[PDB]
Phi, psi and omega in degrees: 000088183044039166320327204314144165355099231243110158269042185251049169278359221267090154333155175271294224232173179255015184275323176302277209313339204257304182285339179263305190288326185255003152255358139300004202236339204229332174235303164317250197106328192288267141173053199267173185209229184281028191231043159100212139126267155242017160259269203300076185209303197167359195263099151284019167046154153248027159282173202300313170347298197279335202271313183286351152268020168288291169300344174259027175194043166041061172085039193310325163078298169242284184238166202278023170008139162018108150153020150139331182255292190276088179155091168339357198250019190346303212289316182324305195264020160278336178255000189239325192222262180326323185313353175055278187302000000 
C-alpha cells in the first residue's frame, strides 16, 4: 500500500528519527516514515515492541488506539504514554 519510498521521511524531533530509521530499516527496507503506511496504522509486527504496547494498553487485541503504532506523532506519544514515568 504506496510502500514506496515515502518522501516524508524528515522528523521532528530526533527520538522520530532515530525510531523510524531502525525500523525502516531491519523490517521496512523500504524507505517510509511519517506519512502513514503499515507500521504507524494497526499492523502490530510481531517484535517484542508491538507485544509492549500491547500491554501497555491493557490488551488492544485488534487495533493499537493511542498508545505508539496507531498515531503519526512517535514523539507526541513519547511524552504522553511512553514518558512512562
Amino acid at each position: 500500500m504506496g510502500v514506496t519510498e515515502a518522501q516524508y521521511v524528515a522528523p521532528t524531533n530526533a527520538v522520530e528519527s532515530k525510531l523510524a530509521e531502525i525500523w525502516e530499516r531491519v523490517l521496512g527496507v523500504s524507505g517510509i516514515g511519517i506519512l502513514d503506511n503499515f507500521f504507524q496504522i494497526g499492523g502490530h509486527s510481531l517484535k517484542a515492541m508491538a507485544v509492549a504496547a500491547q500491554v501497555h494498553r491493557e490488551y488492544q487485541v485488534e487495533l493499537p488506539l493511542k498508545v505508539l503504532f496507531a498515531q503519526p506523532t512517535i514523539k507526541a506519544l513519547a511524552q504522553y504514554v511512553a514518558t512512562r514515568s
